[PDB]
Copies of this chain bind each other. A is one copy, B any other.
């Protein structure tokens, strides 16, 4: 008596629908609509998302608002701090608050550093902070008399997010960057610390499916009655410096991500793709002209 009902669905795009480079920000959404009912009224069903493919989409790599970076210059002779300046990303950011290239994250940190040294260090001893495309690691390029005279300072947010450099803590907030070579690099990639993207989610405002329990909407009370609809949640990881992506999800062996279907009598519902950031700020996945999206669902009877 076990029944398997498979529902495929797709989304084509174009320049008229999405605008140049996805300027219109059209959310990825699909209206499933059929002439008859999908499920039998005698049976109880579970819903699982078997697969999806988000082919040719754009995702942000950095979100300055979440971070509070600061750089500084220390002196060896006087043994005191020369200055401290916050990293200003304002010129590099798009309207929605995001950046799309770790070269630009590296550039912004460099301009803050070069600007801080303007009065106090000579031109050819100004250290350069940059992002290497090959190794996916940030590097610090320095002269030998700079290393003898001064140190570069990172505050705790810079310390943590660029953790694979070598550090020597001077106080509660600031740390010195230990530099022995002309070109010093990270021991390891830390791009996972910089990406704002946490999860990608499929939701539905009208599908009669059992909600997931959530914590309190407010920041105050532990007590909560809050719920939400989630059909699958895919954990996103940023392996490299590619803002343009092609994301394949295929359910594996265990396939534990089931949700109860509450009402059998329906022929219509909406599905949407939503991106959650690490700060829990929600925003929709948007189409490019060249985006194709595939989706496969399974309604399984019990």
Please list the residues of chain A having a beta carbon within 8 angstroms of any beta carbon in chain B. 1-10, 12, 15, 20-21, 23, 31-36, 38, 44, 46, 48, 50-51, 53, 55-56, 101, 103, 133-134, 156-157, 160-161, 163-164, 166, 169, 172-173, 187-188, 192-193, 198, 210, 212-215, 222-225, 230, 233, 235, 237, 240-244, 246, 248, 250-260, 278-280, 288-290, 292, 294, 296, 298, 300, 302
Contacts and interface: CB of A to CB of B under 8 A. Distances in A.
Nearest to A186: B133
A141 to B, nearest CB: 15
Contacts of A56: 160, 193
Given A6-B212, A254-B251, A160 B244 contact: yes
A57 B31 CA distance: 38
Given A15-B156, A250-B253, 15 more contacts: A2-B260, A2-B302, A10-B215, A10-B280, A38-B213, A50-B254, A50-B256, A156-B290, A157-B289, A187-B242, A193-B246, A198-B292, A235-B248, A252-B254, A254-B255
Nearest to A292: B278
Nearest to A295: B215
B156 A215 contact: no
A103 to B, nearest CB: 7
A48 B223 contact: no
A35 B279 contact: no
B23 A172 contact: yes
A294 B198 CA distance: 10
- Tallying the copies of this chain within the complex gives 5
B50 A235 contact: no
Contact of A188 (B233, B240, B252, B278): B240
Given A8-B215, A34-B213, A225-B34, A250 B242 contact: no
Contacts of A7: 212-213
A5 B209 CA distance: 11
Contacts of A166: 101, 103, 133
A38 B255 CA distance: 23
A142 B259 CA distance: 56
The 4 A-B residue pairs whose C-beta atoms are closest, nearest first, are A252-B253, A163-B244, A6-B212, A35-B225
Nearest to A173: B20
Contacts of A21: 156, 169, 172
A186 to B, nearest CB: 9
B244 A134 contact: no
Contacts of A164: 241-242
B259 A214 contact: no
A194 to B, nearest CB: 11
Nearest to A103: B166
A38 to B, nearest CB: 7
A45 to B, nearest CB: 10
A159 to B, nearest CB: 8
B1 A44 contact: yes
